[PDB]
Design a binder for this molecule. Structure first.
Ligand SMILES: [Zn+2]
Ligand SMILES: [Zn+2]
Ligand SMILES: [Zn+2]
Length: 123
């Protein structure tokens, strides 16, 4: 276990949200490989060419006690906003619900996320 005076963060876990296959979709994704039972923040980031076709995605977390929402939008009124606080489950995962509303969806590029972990104690 890491002493509190030695607190650091790891903000290098990045990943992609699976793109929808239809213009309107509600679906889930399990993020895996996280330290079991650790507490995290996930935030959106963007490094992504705009579709110009109004690709909206909203994300929440299904884990008990998770709070927050993440918003993406790529066209004019850009959104890369919100965050979720959550705890990985006992198997190192967390499930998210994605609600997508895309005006057009030909080979849609994934929206992107960053996980922030405080490395302290056993977290
Ligand atoms: Zn799994
Ligand atoms: Zn509670
Ligand atoms: Zn294709």
């Amino acid at each position: 276990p890491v002493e509190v005076s030695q607190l650091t963060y790891n903000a290098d876990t990045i990943g992609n949200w699976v793109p929808p296959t239809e213009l309107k979709q509600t679906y889930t994704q399990d993020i895996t490989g996280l330290k079991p039972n650790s507490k995290f923040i996930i935030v959106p980031y963007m490094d992504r060419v705009s579709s110009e076709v109004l690709q909206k995605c909203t994300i929440t977390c299904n884990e008990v006690d998770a709070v927050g929402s993440i918003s993406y939008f790529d066209t004019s009124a850009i959104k890369c906003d919100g965050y979720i606080s959550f705890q990985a489950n006992s198997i190192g995962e967390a499930t998210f619900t994605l609600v997508t509303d895309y005006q057009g969806a030909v080979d849609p590029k994934p929206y992107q996320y960053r996980i922030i972990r405080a490395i302290v104690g056993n977290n």
